[PDB]
């Protein structure tokens, strides 16, 4: 006979949350990845200096002169950050993150410019030789959709 | 947090179920993300008082989707089941938008 | 004989407002707290620098090099922000806020990482020693329900 | 002899619409103003930076580094947004709006905090000196009833 204004408006806010659910869920993940990136960076300094001073990429965190323990460079969504031959990889925690990005990671690596180096940011990579890396293809890479426009670099970016 | 709120206080709502009541609603309790609403005993039909429904959600991964239907219990973080017991509001009294089954996806 | 469509629909919008009342009232409070947090932050800079440059936490706002007057770091819902030995506490005004959060506050404190510091955000805390704080247990803490997921830190968080 | 249930219920929905008419008509206007406010903001950035970098308020849009043309910062209910000496005013279109708010506007202005500035939001204002504005009293101000609780600032708010 009457009461449908309360019933529909409680059910439009319910469906509004369902539509606002995936937007906040990738905005959210995309936000948790933007930090793995900040934790990865700032460690470029150590790595850059080590390379320019010696001409060899730092083998591990201790070589680069950073928390000798990967797990000591963690965060809220970051379970750690390891330096492996100049390549700095950031791992996403398992608690406090999206759902399709946890335990997932990215990498920052550089290239000899000769007198200086240039840095790249993208999906996990392994270093082959002092001037070549390759996709750490394995299945734990953070999905392209979660990576900034500034971190879409490919293993062979120059 | 990636975990469903255990109770009202966890969800950050009137720590007391009875504090989320109404004219026909005797309360609303959050039990592991599942929100159940109980029908008062005074001021209602006759075959719906003391009866209730539930709203529960499901991880969409990055977001969640909500369901509305007859009382349900949460089993695991992504599974609930009919709170079969006899106090569910009869299908005839539920909107077309609240006919969801325990296994709706 | 007739007119119940106008009577029920005016009474469903009335009860719709009553159901929409607590949702807007915690969404609202949760919004007024999210600012006390923004006012508290951005003062991390002063405090961080003071600590790293001297190895001692700033005793008060003036030491940290900020509005020497706590009341000078207020807002709409924020009655102020005081720095007490590196701990930055934000107080909720008494006018313009929820109802169960006014005159209530939170704290931001940091911890020596050795070469850098890490910040925490949560319910009011007091500093004991240069690397230890404790619950400013007293009854004026902003209730957990009003605090973001990013500001649920405990006095002993590391 | 009979048919009054159809006659009354068609006439209760008719009067229900008449009662729901003013509610949707201020909820509506109040909604069209909330945007003039969003269009006004986000231009605070340009204005803030211009002031902090030079110590003088941007004279006009071009100075602030925004669509050199006021009319280029319009919307659905917004006919434009002009920056006049740091004061940003938003004008309500003439088509697509309430009825007692079209061609009407509001202003956002700031104040030197010394090292930073604080923003205000309210009824149209004019800038007198670098730290003083005044009511642009003229009759085209959006009525207090249509302004959010967050945009009730007076010319002398500090
Ligand atoms: C740090 O990175 C260096 C990269 O050249 C690496 N050196 C070489 C030649 O690979 C360092 O390892 C050397 O020093 C450690 C010290 O304990 C050890 O002796 C290794 O045998 C030697 O290669 C890297 N340091 C560490 C601690 O691994
Ligand atoms: C709120 O829901 C939480 C869901 O994870 C739940 N935590 C866990 C781990 O189940 C909270 O309970 C925790 O906190 C309370 C606080 O008194 C108590 O210490 C419990 O032992 C602990 O599990 C839920 N909060 C409450 C108040 O129940
Ligand atoms: C600022 O924080 C400092 C933290 O070390 C604190 N110093 C010490 C040793 O606690 C400053 O106080 C010192 O300087 C003021 C200046 O008037 C005064 O002389 C105090 O006696 C002295 O401790 C803090 N500055 C202020 C103004 O309190
Ligand atoms: C932008 O705002 C400035 C605020 O100081 C204003 N400058 C002054 C001194 O008022 C700019 O105007 C100056 O530059 C324009 C450029 O054509 C013109 O030369 C004016 O004479 C000069 O005042 C403002 N820029 C514009 C384009 O108005």
UniProtKB/Swiss-Prot annotation, chain B:
Keyword Transcription tagged: no
Cystine connections: 68-98
GO-annotated biological processes: cell adhesion
Top-level taxon of origin: Bacteria
Null mutant phenotype: Deletion mutants show a complete absence of observable pili.
Residue(s) carrying O-(sn-1-glycerophosphoryl)serine: 41
PTM description: The O-linked glycan identified as Gal-GlcNAc disaccharide in PubMed:7477282 and PubMed:10048019 is now identified as either a hexosyl-diacetamidotrideoxyhexoside (DATDHex) by mass spectrometry in PubMed:15249686, or alpha-D-galactopyranosyl-(1->3)-2,4-diacetamido-2,4-dideoxy-beta-D-glucopyranoside (DADDGlc) by X-ray diffraction in PubMed:16949362. It is not clear whether there is a chemical difference in the glycosylation of the two derivatives of strain MS11 used in these experiments, or not. In some MS11 derivative strains, Ser-15 is modified to O-(2-aminoethylphosphoryl)serine, and in some other derivatives that can be secondarily modified to O-(2-cholinephosphoryl)serine by N-methylation.
Record PTM O-(2-aminoethylphosphoryl)serine, positions in chain: 15
GO cellular component: membrane; pilus
Membrane topology: Single-pass membrane protein
Keyword Acetylation set for record: no
Glycan attachment sites: 10
O-(2-cholinephosphoryl)serine PTM sites in chain numbering: 15
Positions bearing Phosphoserine: 15
Localization per record: Fimbrium; Membrane
Alphabetized UniProt keyword annotations: Cell adhesion, Disulfide bond, Fimbrium, Glycoprotein, Membrane, Methylation, Phosphoprotein, Transmembrane, Transmembrane helix
Family in the record: Belongs to the N-Me-Phe pilin family.
Summary of subunit composition and partner proteins: The pili are polar flexible filaments of about 5.4 nanometers diameter and 2.5 micrometers average length; they consist of only a single polypeptide chain arranged in a helical configuration of five subunits per turn in the assembled pilus.
The protein's name: Type IV major pilin protein PilE1
Annotated gene: pilE1
Residue range from the parent sequence: 61 to 165 of 165
